[PDB]
Every structure is written in C-alpha cells, then in structure tokens.
C-alpha cells in the first residue's frame, strides 16, 4: 500500500514496534518478517515478545541479532477479512560514513542510439539519506532525474545510491558542463563531480 | 513437509486476464484456508482474497471485490486465483499462503504480475566508463546501464560471476515511457584497469536477450 | 498525487525545470507558482521567467532566483481528452547547516487526570529540513507510536522547525520511568538526547 | 475586479454526497473554460474537471470517474462541482478556477476544504506544553499549547489574542489513527519573562463552533 517506514538500531538493542487497532473488535493480531527478495515468515513467538499496549498491539524484539533486520508487518484479521499495517523496517546503526562520488558521461554508443543518461554514483555510505542535486551549464535541473538505493551492505553496512540524468540527444549536445552535487550528513559541504562534454 | 508452489504469472494487457495456481503438498488444501497476499514493487503486503476450507465461498479486498475469482480443486489439491479486468495497479509479486488454526504460516515462493500496455524488449546495454578523473583514492569505479528493458526482471554479473566484490547493482526504476532501467556498478583498483578487462553479463530472460558488455576507458 | 520535490538553491541562481510529459507530442503547458496557504498563481513566461519545449519536454527556467521565486512550481499539461498536473518542485531558500535545539515536553497533569498521555519533543530552528527523531522508553526503541510535523521555511532565517508526539494510553505511560528522544541531524557530530524521568 | 469565491466544503462521511459552488464576479462563466483543481493536505496539485465555454461540454479526471459531475448556471453565474460516492482519498482542499503560448488559469478562488470520513465533529481539547529548567537553555524558555483530539479541520491557534507572532510555530495537523486531529503550538520567549509576562494560547475550530483559551504556566 505505501514504502515502509524506517528504524534504526545497533546489534543487541531493545525494539518495540507498535501496531495501532484500527476499529477491530478483537485481539487478532499476528507478526510478520520479510527480508529482501524472499516471501514472509510468521513470528513464532524467545527474543520475540508480544503484548497488549493500551488497545493497540506491540512487538518487542528483547536483543536485536543480525538476522533481526527486515521488514516486519502487523496483520489484524476480523476473520471475514485480512489487513496489513505499514512496513517497519529496521536498519543496522553504524558510524556515519561519507559518500565518494563519481559521475559518467553517456556512451558514444548511447548518443548513436538516440538518447543521453548521464549517472552520477554515490558509494558506501550512511545513513541512507542523501541529496543529489544536478546541473546543466549551470543551471539547476529538476523533473528529469531518477535516483535508486541498494540495501544496506551486509560487510560494513553502508549505502550505494544512484541518480540518472536523462536528456534527449539533441539537447544534451547544446550544453557543454554537467554536474551532479551532493548532500550528507557526512559532508560539511557539498561535494560536485562533473565534466565537460566533447 | 508442507510447501506450495505457484505459477501462472506473467505479463498481461490491462483489461486482460491471467490465472494462478498453487499447488500444496503435505497437505490437502480443504482442511485449510488458502490466501492470496500480493506486493507491489517496493511497497508493503496486501491482502487479495481467501477461501474457507470446509465449503467454498470467498472473502475479497474492496481493491479486488468483483474483478477476482478465488476457487480451489478439492482431488488435486490446487487453489487458484481468476484474475480479470487488470489494471495497472494490479502490477505486483503475488503470493499464495496457508493459514492455520495462529496466521499464515507457510507461503508460496511467489510469482510476478505485470499489468501494462508496454511491448517485451530486451535491454540495450551501455558503458560507464572508468576515467582518471573518477576516483577515490586508487579506487575506480565503472558500470553498465541497463536501459529501456521490459517487464522485469534482468539479472547481471561481473566478469561471469568472478567478481562479486565491490558490485552494486541497483534496483530497476519505472520510467515515464513504461519502460525499466538500472544500472550496475563496481569499484576496482585503478591500477588494476590497465591488465584486467571488465565484462557485465546482462540476462534479460522475457526477451530472450543476452548480453556481455566489456567496460573500458 | 504525490509529494513535491524538493530543490535548495540562492538568490542569483538559474533554475530549469523539467515538465515530465506523456504522449505528448501534440501537447501544450502552463506553468504555475503556489506559496503556503495559498492558491496557484499562472506564471506568465518569454522576461525573469522563460520557457522552451525540448522534445516532448517542457522546461521552465528561472534565469536569476529572487527572494519572491522561492515556492513550489507545477506543470499543467492539457491535449486531446487529457488534462494532467506534473508533481511540484519546491524550491527552497539555501543557507548554512544550523542545528536544532531540542526540549523534551512530558504529559501534562491535566491531561493525564483526563486519562491519556502525549510526550512532545520539539526541534527548533535547524537547516537542512532532513532530521531523525527516534524515541525510547527505559532504552527501547519505539516505532509506530509517534507522529511528526515539520512547519515551512521560516521567513525570520529560513529554518525548519518540527514536533513529534509520542503517544500512550495513561497505563502504559505510568509503567515506564525513563522518556527521551534522540535528535539526528547535519548540525549535530554527534546525537542530541533530551530526556526525563516520569514522576520529577 | 475579477474574482472567483468557493462554498459548500465540509464534513460528509464515505459514500455520501457533496455540492461545491463558485460564485464567479468580473466576468461571466459563460465565456470562459471552468476548472476544479484539488489539493490533499502536503500533496501536490490534482486536476479534477472542466466545463467549456458556450456550449458547456465537460471533461473529468479518472480519479472522479462518473462520481463527479461539473456543470455551471449563467444566470446565476455559478460553476459547481456534484460530488457523489466520496471515498476518503477524496479529503482535499478544492479550488475553482478560470482560463484565459501565454493561456492558462489565470484567476483562482480561495479554496474549500473538504473532509470525508467516518469520524464526528468534535472539538479539542486543549493542554499545555509547561516551560521549564529543561525547556529553558541560554536565556530562552520554549512553552506551547498541545491542541489535541479535534474533528474536522482546521484549527487555528493565536498567541495572547495576537499580540504575539514572534518565535512562533503552529505545527501542521497529523491525522492520528483514530481518526481525529492534533496539532501543537510552540512559541520561544525569553527564560526572565516566565515570572512576569503572561502567555495564552487561543484555539478556534470553527466546524465546533469552539473557543478555548489556555493559560499556559510554569510547572
Ligand atoms: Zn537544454
Ligand atoms: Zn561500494
Ligand atoms: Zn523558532
């Protein structure tokens, strides 16, 4: 129904995620685990606790362990009927780590084929969080660009990201300087990768 | 041992049709309810339809209501999931799962929907090239985009799966044309560059394409 | 239908931005400029504001931002049986990171005699809008018990501001002694934690 | 002297059914494309129907599928917009606008919100947010009005009947779960003014017809 919202935690924290009864008239609750790729696991629950938080209904994870960070899902069932809550996903804390950036031109064998992406890369970081703003001859660009993120790295637990500039052929020939600039929390000003077309 | 397969999915026209089954085995479906969960890419779970295990009759999301059918044979333990009029919105992994009586507590693997007026074609595959100007360090970083490809999903490797270090590849983006892209990259040491060559392997099996594009400067 | 884009910029600098179109072709636009609390104004472009149509896209460009161009622009796109608005690019006012200054609000007397309990933690006056709340009670990590908002850029210095209510069931409120929220941001080295205990 | 003003916005539950009128001045709608556009709260512009000029043919948004009818009365001079079936996706501040390289609506009404849901009218309760040795840093002490358990929107907050706006924040409302709203009031003020100067919240929510004051004091 919606992306899943974020939380996140270090290894042998204590997580409670709360589940809110919408207008139920009983307490039909049940837990869900899901990790990337794979189908939904129902909770069993000895880490793995739940209660009864005023009418509402809570999840509470006693000692987080490396396998404990997915994307959980509360379902309430009525039972003529299923629902779903949103998403919680619960994410690895680490040391903020900034992003090394780099940017690439479009291929000769793009430009033949009609279009121009440029790709601007940002490279392990955190947290996830990151703005990238582009430019063109040194004008601002909004609307033609799309970003996308990797899951959390299962080594360092850092972030990769990137942001696609897509120009028409034609139009990417009458500017000469692309750039991408970046935000973080890791960098106290922003840091730029471009070039110069030709 | 319990376990559901599935199958049936596939691409579609909206205003279309598909059907799905889910084959059980160690069990028999009619002392069970079955249910069907879809997700969208990158969105939560939704609950699609159930049966009861006893008699028939169904229960559907007001999303669905009278669009799907859910029935299931009773000899060969199969529940199926008659999905008419498609929308877009329709477009989702969907699962089958069993429910005990607390939740379901065994799933299909899942199966792929896509709902869209979008043709099959397969991936044109484009270099990021390494630049002495791209680095971090003594590290380079390098690439392929995979552009303009539909439906999902494409897979790539490095190097025919010799090099896993360092890759990233990103998840697809639903451009405005109704066509998908992504692309994957690696870093390497730029020292490196000059006697190591760098090959991504681009499967795009819906169109029975294939692809290994050699990245250099 | 969906949130706008959100773009930091300066007084003096060019902006464009794209119109992402559909089967247009045989399409024309018009551009609009809404400020909070507001309804849309019709920008009218050729002599700041100008605009071109490169392909299927439209662009509007804004060749050197004013102190009056900072809000939040819409395409509209209109042809044969199709009438549509773009999402919004918000453009908002750039300047230094500033962090927050936090303070921690627990549940009124009053509101605790009426049989509920809400905690506010409060955020003030801190740039870049992107900031973290996280709430604990005695060290455990809460999620889907709070809700957030965040007001516009601040004409005074061009902050954000934001709130986030914790809330609990009078019981479950007076079985717990520690509250607290951490604050991340930009401005912040390291996590600001303001916290109470129940009952001081 | 052109001017386009909006009525008819309110509470209606799911299901139900809601007429929007703009009355137009300066100029006839008979000579003029029509527009509904709407707006849900933090959301971007949404286009919802159109009525031609002279002939009065009409055009909608899928979104309002055969739910929503415009039409426009020249006599009286007054476009409307027949909401039916409303779901709660529905929930937006509407506008009317008019047409006009250089086209587009160039006039645009005041907007009327519009809420559907299940939820009753209720009004707020109100609580303070009590400065303190916590609240207070530097010099500055933060203290505000918690406005809770309000249906429908808006509320409005002011500070000593007005008198304060400096330091101010009056948070956007958050649709809790329940289905009511809440929002806070936040003010900043100097920490040596606590024992002296008076601070009073005043909360507005017009569709209760409720006024509240709140002195808000030192724990
Ligand atoms: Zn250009
Ligand atoms: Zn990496
Ligand atoms: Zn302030």
């Known amino acids: 129904?919606?992306?899943?919202?974020?939380?996140?935690?270090?290894?042998?924290?204590?997580?409670?995620?709360?589940?809110?009864?919408?207008?139920?008239?009983?307490?039909?609750?049940?837990?869900?685990?899901?990790?990337?790729?794979?189908?939904?696991?129902?909770?069993?629950?000895?880490?793995?606790?739940?209660?009864?938080?005023?009418?509402?209904?809570?999840?509470?994870?006693?000692?987080?362990?490396?396998?404990?960070?997915?994307?959980?899902?509360?379902?309430?069932?009525?039972?003529?009927?299923?629902?779903?809550?949103?998403?919680?996903?619960?994410?690895?804390?680490?040391?903020?780590?900034?992003?090394?950036?780099?940017?690439?031109?479009?291929?000769?064998?793009?430009?033949?084929?009609?279009?121009?992406?440029?790709?601007?890369?940002?490279?392990?970081?955190?947290?996830?969080?990151?703005?990238?703003?582009?430019?063109?001859?040194?004008?601002?660009?909004?609307?033609?660009?799309?970003?996308?993120?990797?899951?959390?790295?299962?080594?360092?637990?850092?972030?990769?990201?990137?942001?696609?500039?897509?120009?028409?052929?034609?139009?990417?020939?009458?500017?000469?300087?692309?750039?991408?600039?970046?935000?973080?929390?890791?960098?106290?000003?922003?840091?730029?990768?471009?070039?110069?077309?030709? | 041992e319990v376990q559901l397969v599935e199958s049936g999915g596939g691409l579609v026209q909206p205003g279309g049709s598909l059907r799905l089954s889910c084959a059980a085995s160690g069990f028999n479906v009619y002392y069970y309810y079955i249910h069907w969960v879809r997700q969208a890419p990158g969105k939560g779970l939704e609950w699609?339809?159930?049966?009861?295990?006893?008699?028939?009759?169904?229960?559907?999301?007001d999303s669905v209501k009278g669009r799907f059918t859910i029935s299931a044979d009773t000899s060969k333990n199969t529940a199926y999931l008659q999905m008419n009029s498609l929308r877009a919105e329709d477009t989702a992994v969907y699962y089958c799962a069993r429910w005990s009586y607390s939740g379901m507590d065994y799933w299909g693997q899942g199966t792929l929907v896509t709902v869209s007026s979008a043709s099959t074609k397969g991936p044109s595959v484009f270099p990021l090239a390494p630049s002495s100007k791209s680095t971090s360090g003594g590290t380079a970083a390098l690439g392929c985009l995979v552009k303009d490809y539909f439906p999902e999903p494409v897979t790539v490797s490095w190097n025919s799966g010799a090099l896993t270090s360092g890759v990233h590849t990103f998840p697809a983006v639903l451009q405005s044309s109704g066509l998908y892209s992504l692309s994957s990259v690696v870093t390497v040491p730029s020292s490196s560059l000059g006697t190591q060559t760098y090959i991504c392997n681009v499967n795009h099996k819906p169109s029975n394409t294939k692809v290994d594009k050699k990245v250099e400067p | 239908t969906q949130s706008p884009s959100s773009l930091s910029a300066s007084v003096g600098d060019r902006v464009t931005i794209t119109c992402r179109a559909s089967?247009?072709?045989?399409?024309?636009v018009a551009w609009y400029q809404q400020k909070p609390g507001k309804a849309p104004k019709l920008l009218i472009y050729?002599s700041r504001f100008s605009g071109s149509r490169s392909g299927t896209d439209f662009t509007l460009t804004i060749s050197s931002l004013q102190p009056e161009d900072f809000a939040t622009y819409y395409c509209?796109?209109?042809?044969?049986?199709?009438?549509?608005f773009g999402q919004g690019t918000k453009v908002e006012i750039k300047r230094t990171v500033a962090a927050p200054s936090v303070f921690i609000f627990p549940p009124s007397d009053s509101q605790l005699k009426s049989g509920t309990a809400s905690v506010v933690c409060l955020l003030n006056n801190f740039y870049p809008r992107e900031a973290k709340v996280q709430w604990k009670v005695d060290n455990a990590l809460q999620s889907g018990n709070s809700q957030e908002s965040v007001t516009e850029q601040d004409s005074k210095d061009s902050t954000y501001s934001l709130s986030s209510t914790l809330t609990l069931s009078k019981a479950d409120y007076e079985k717990h002694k520690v509250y607290a929220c951490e604050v991340t941001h930009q401005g912040l080295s390291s996590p600001v934690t303001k916290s109470f205990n129940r009952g001081e | 002297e052109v001017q386009l003003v909006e009525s008819g916005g309110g509470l209606v539950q799911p299901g139900g059914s809601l007429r929007l009128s703009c009355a137009a001045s300066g100029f006839n709608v008979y000579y003029y494309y029509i527009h509904w556009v709407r707006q849900a709260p933090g959301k971007g512009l949404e286009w919802v129907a159109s009525?031609?000029?002279?002939?009065?043919?009409?055009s909608y948004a899928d979104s309002v599928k055969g739910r929503f009818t415009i039409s426009a009365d020249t006599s009286k001079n007054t476009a409307y917009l027949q909401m039916n079936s409303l779901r709660a996706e529905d929930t937006a501040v509407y506008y009317c606008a008019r047409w006009s390289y250089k086209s587009g609506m160039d006039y645009w009404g005041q907007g009327t919100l519009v809420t559907v849901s299940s939820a009753s009218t209720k009004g707020p309760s109100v609580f303070p947010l009590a400065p303190s040795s916590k609240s207070t840093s530097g010099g500055t002490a933060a203290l505000g009005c918690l406005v809770k358990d309000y249906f429908p929107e808006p509320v409005t907050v002011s500070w000593n009947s007005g008198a304060l706006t400096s330091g101010v924040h009056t948070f956007p409302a958050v649709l809790q779960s329940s289905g009511l709203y809440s929002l806070s009031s936040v003010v900043t003020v100097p920490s040596s003014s606590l024992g002296t100067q008076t601070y009073i919240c005043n909360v507005n929510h017009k569709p209760s017809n409720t006024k509240v004051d709140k002195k808000v004091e030192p724990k």
């Open positions: 089967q247009s072709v045989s399409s024309a």
């Open positions: 509209q796109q209109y042809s044969y049986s199709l009438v549509t």
């Open positions: 050729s």
């Open positions: 009525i031609s000029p002279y002939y009065g043919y009409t």
